[PDB]
Design a protein around this motif. Structure first.
Motif, PDB file in Angstrom:
ATOM      1  N   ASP B  70     -16.171 -33.585  -6.299  1.00  0.00           N
ATOM      2  CA  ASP B  70     -16.294 -34.797  -7.082  1.00  0.00           C
ATOM      3  C   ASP B  70     -15.372 -35.889  -6.594  1.00  0.00           C
ATOM      4  N   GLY B  71     -14.967 -35.783  -5.327  1.00  0.00           N
ATOM      5  CA  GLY B  71     -14.048 -36.748  -4.724  1.00  0.00           C
ATOM      6  C   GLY B  71     -12.610 -36.468  -5.097  1.00  0.00           C
ATOM      7  N   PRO B  72     -11.701 -37.367  -4.712  1.00  0.00           N
ATOM      8  CA  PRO B  72     -10.287 -37.255  -4.979  1.00  0.00           C
ATOM      9  C   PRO B  72     -10.013 -36.990  -6.445  1.00  0.00           C
ATOM     10  N   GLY B  73      -9.052 -36.120  -6.728  1.00  0.00           N
ATOM     11  CA  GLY B  73      -8.755 -35.686  -8.104  1.00  0.00           C
ATOM     12  C   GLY B  73      -9.842 -34.915  -8.808  1.00  0.00           C
ATOM     13  N   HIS B  74      -9.781 -34.945 -10.118  1.00  0.00           N
ATOM     14  CA  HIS B  74     -10.690 -34.239 -10.944  1.00  0.00           C
ATOM     15  C   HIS B  74     -10.607 -32.779 -10.584  1.00  0.00           C
ATOM     16  N   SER B  75     -11.701 -32.187 -10.149  1.00  0.00           N
ATOM     17  CA  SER B  75     -11.706 -30.774  -9.816  1.00  0.00           C
ATOM     18  C   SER B  75     -11.170 -30.648  -8.405  1.00  0.00           C
ATOM     19  N   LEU B  76     -10.223 -29.738  -8.257  1.00  0.00           N
ATOM     20  CA  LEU B  76      -9.520 -29.532  -6.983  1.00  0.00           C
ATOM     21  C   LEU B  76     -10.081 -28.333  -6.293  1.00  0.00           C
ATOM     22  N   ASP B  93     -11.638 -28.390  -2.588  1.00  0.00           N
ATOM     23  CA  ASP B  93     -12.190 -29.739  -2.381  1.00  0.00           C
ATOM     24  C   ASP B  93     -11.329 -30.465  -1.356  1.00  0.00           C
ATOM     25  N   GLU B  96      -9.110 -33.716  -1.684  1.00  0.00           N
ATOM     26  CA  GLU B  96      -7.744 -33.636  -2.030  1.00  0.00           C
ATOM     27  C   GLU B  96      -6.997 -33.631  -0.731  1.00  0.00           C
TER      28      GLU B  96
END
Ligand SMILES: [Ca+2]
Ligand SMILES: [Ca+2]
Ligand SMILES: [Ca+2]
Ligand SMILES: [Zn+2]
Ligand SMILES: [Zn+2]
Lengths: 182, 159
Positions: B70-76, B93, B96
């Motif tokens: 989901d891109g930078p941050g959020h779910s790692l 991800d 990150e």
């Protein structure tokens, strides 16, 4: 599943779809698959879209998520008359998916300013970087960046800046926290 | 399966993030395993080709599993409980910035949590537990410790 927390503006700016909704029913489905025999199950929530702040013209009718929290699955209170603000990703007409790490909160928990920010203020600030400060002291790297201090000052992800502030670009190129308008 | 039906498990590091030399990724995952080797009769061995029980990889956005990053941050990262094929596997991800220290997202801390899932653990509501989904044990690496809640969980499965 491992999440880093998200300020509502970040969520709003990162998400394809942002809606107010209620989940009416729940059930498992198989959408896949997997390259050996073995299939991947997802929970499909049937929802009613009460209102859209961001996303496609065709209303969302279904939200998907994983069956286990290991893969970032999330529970919505179904039947239970529970309204949510949901920020997540579009997945073709009338469908979206969400994860444990998405901004997803009961409607009634939002501050008045959070709700109003969904009209415009969060969108205005997407060009700005919001950076969570892990511990005092912490410093902006770039002028177009706000320091998110809720955890450090409050030990609370839905803290003061979350509830009341947006990180907006300030004529000139610096970004700063604003408690706002509207 | 809520648990693996064997004692000796295999893992393989399928691919490698640009953020770190291969040796540094190797070491972080080795330490993360160790965490679970010290409190169970489990032993892990590394495979450099083919299909290990626990296939560990880095990916961004859609990567073939219905659970897009989901891109930078959020779910790692995320992982699958014990089972054949995709089950037991770990995905990080790569939007990150994976680091060895606490400057970026720490790979060791995340890999340790996710391995918990690979072994059968669920999330803990204890905010000092490794299995709490939100940074688990916020900073202290050179004195990181499983919580007793984590040990109880894992020993309830494997003794
Ligand atoms: Ca596997
Ligand atoms: Ca991510
Ligand atoms: Ca990366
Ligand atoms: Zn987890
Ligand atoms: Zn994945």
């Amino acid at each position: 599943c491992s999440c880093s927390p998200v300020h509502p503006q970040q969520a709003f700016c990162n998400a394809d779809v942002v809606i107010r909704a209620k989940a009416v029913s729940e059930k498992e489905v198989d959408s896949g698959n997997d390259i050996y025999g073995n299939p991947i199950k997802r929970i499909q929530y049937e929802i009613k879209q009460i209102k859209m702040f961001k996303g496609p013209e065709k209303d969302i009718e279904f939200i998907y998520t994983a069956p286990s929290s290991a893969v970032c699955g999330v529970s919505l209170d179904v039947g239970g008359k529970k309204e949510y603000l949901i920020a997540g990703k579009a997945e073709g007409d009338g469908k979206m998916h969400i994860t444990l790490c998405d901004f997803i909160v009961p409607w009634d928990t939002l501050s008045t300013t959070q709700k109003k920010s969904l009209n415009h203020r969060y969108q205005m600030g997407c060009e700005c970087k919001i950076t969570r400060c892990p511990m005092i002291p912490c410093y902006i790297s770039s002028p177009d960046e706000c320091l998110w201090m809720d955890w450090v000052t409050e030990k609370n992800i839905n803290g003061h800046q979350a509830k009341f502030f947006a990180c907006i670009k300030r004529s000139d190129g610096s970004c700063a926290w604003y408690r706002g308008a509207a | 399966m809520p648990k693996w039906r064997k004692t000796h498990l295999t893992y393989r590091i399928v691919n490698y993030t640009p953020d770190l030399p291969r040796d540094a990724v190797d070491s972080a995952i080795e330490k993360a395993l160790k965490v679970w080797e010290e409190v169970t009769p489990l032993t892990f061995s590394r495979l450099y080709e083919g299909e290990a029980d626990i296939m560990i990889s880095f990916a961004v956005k859609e990567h073939g599993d219905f659970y897009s990053f989901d891109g930078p941050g959020h779910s790692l990262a995320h992982a699958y409980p014990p089972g054949p094929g995709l089950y037991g596997d770990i995905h990080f991800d790569d939007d990150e910035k994976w680091t060895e220290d606490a400057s970026g997202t720490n790979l060791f801390l995340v890999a340790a949590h996710e391995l918990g899932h690979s072994l059968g653990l669920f999330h803990s509501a204890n905010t000092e537990a490794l299995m709490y989904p939100l940074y688990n044990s916020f900073t202290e690496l050179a004195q990181f410790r499983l919580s007793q809640d984590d040990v109880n969980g894992i020993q309830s499965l494997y003794g």
